[PDB]
Amino acid sequence: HMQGSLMLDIGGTWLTAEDRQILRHPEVGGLIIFARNIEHPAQVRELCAAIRAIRPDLLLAVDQEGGRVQRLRQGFVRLPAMRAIADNPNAEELAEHCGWLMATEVQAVGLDLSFAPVLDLDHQRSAVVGSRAFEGDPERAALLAGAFIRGMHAAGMAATGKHFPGHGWAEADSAVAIPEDARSLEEIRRSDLVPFARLAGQLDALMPAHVIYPQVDPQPAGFSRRWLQEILRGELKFDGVIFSDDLSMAGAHVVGDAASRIEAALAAGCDMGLVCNDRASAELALAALQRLKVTPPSRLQRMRGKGYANTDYRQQPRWLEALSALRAAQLID
């Protein structure tokens, strides 16, 4: 039996009858919630509880978009960005507290995971070529995100890096065409690949970039056997979960419908296909998984959170200790 699974999403802040029926299918292994599914923490905890009453084994993920939920949604704990953390004598300690705080609250409301940390690099386009601004400091980026991952795991949450192998140098041409990064493999390996190489042993999952690297392979990372099998699993020895990219973002990347795209993603080596913002496409990908008679990836349940839904997390001593460490470093309040 081929292995594979589908992660999908819903329309609203509660489950419709159609949501409840699609979640029963065992090929569906996950659900991801976005800002439009989120009112406040109490509502999210209850939505997750409703989903687990149908499917206790489902993986429930939140995509926070660099922190949008904590911010357009009153009630979620509020945490410094990594730039603010990097500017401290105890930046690694402070990064751990943030990963711990973020993962503790996310699991408290019933989610398994947040898709974090970002491993992409900021490059200063117009800086002098070869200068530090031009290069983005990948070694420090991996240090801090490695400490952020430590806090995540200490709270019992699996860590997902993105977007492999790094979209920091990608260029878009016509806002519909697929972004490209035309450098050679050796150039990529020495820069945007570095945080992935440094942390591949610690990450539980990776999400591929929606970027073509033409000198390396004609296909986007997440549809590339070369990127996913040769380089990531082979050269980087990565043994965790590969998510696909959003299979319903398909601007000029013509493969066919979501059915033929999830087959392509699974064939390149992804474990779990993501189909967001398109119920009818999610149904098409589901049917494809059914025709292939897939069983879940043996790796999949590694993503399962070890914390648990609770309402008193904000009055636990460890919680107060982490916020008070962020306060003493002038990062909150």
Swiss-Prot record:
Stored PROSITE patterns: GLYCOSYL_HYDROL_F3
Signal peptide: none
Stated name of the protein: Beta-hexosaminidase
Protein family (similarity comment): Belongs to the glycosyl hydrolase 3 family. NagZ subfamily.
Major location category of this protein: cytoplasm
An annotated Gene Ontology molecular function: beta-N-acetylglucosaminidase activity
Enzyme class: hydrolase
Domain of life: Bacteria
EC number(s) per entry: 3.2.1.52
UniProt catalytic activity: Hydrolysis of terminal non-reducing N-acetyl-D-hexosamine residues in N-acetyl-beta-D-hexosaminides
Gene3D superfamilies: Glycoside hydrolase, family 3, N-terminal domain
Keywords, sorted A to Z: Antibiotic resistance, Cell cycle, Cell division, Cell shape, Cell wall biogenesis/degradation, Cytoplasm, Glycosidase, Hydrolase, Peptidoglycan synthesis
